[PDB]
Design a protein around this ligand. Structure first.
Ligand SMILES: CC(C)(COP(=O)(O)O)[C@@H](O)C(=O)NCCC(=O)NCCS
Length: 78
């Protein structure tokens, strides 16, 4: 079982890989809307997290909890 800390790093790493942004633009508290993710990729992230965590999630979960910090808190604490 991942911690919130480990999940925040998984998500920051995913944002970086998915957008090409510099590391300094991706932080735990910035609004996810500022990352320039396509909404296809935002929905794809939910599916990847489903597999990562073994649970069912809303397709739009990352907009619903719109920071890396808030999303990790919600996924680990339900
Ligand atoms: C999340 C989303 C709705 C895409 O939303 P988005 O384009 O805002 O980024 C995607 O998962 C989906 O369900 N459909 C995208 C394309 C589609 O359904 N029809 C194409 C009409 S132009």
């Amino acid at each position: 079982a991942m911690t919130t800390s480990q999940l925040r790093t998984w998500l920051r790493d995913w944002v970086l890989a998915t957008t090409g942004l510099p590391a300094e633009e991706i932080t735990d508290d910035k609004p996810m809307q500022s990352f320039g993710l396509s909404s296809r990729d935002v929905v794809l992230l939910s599916g990847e997290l489903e597999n990562l965590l073994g649970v069912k999630l809303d397709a739009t979960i990352a907009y619903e909890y719109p920071t890396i910090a808030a999303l990790s808190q919600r996924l680990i604490e339900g």
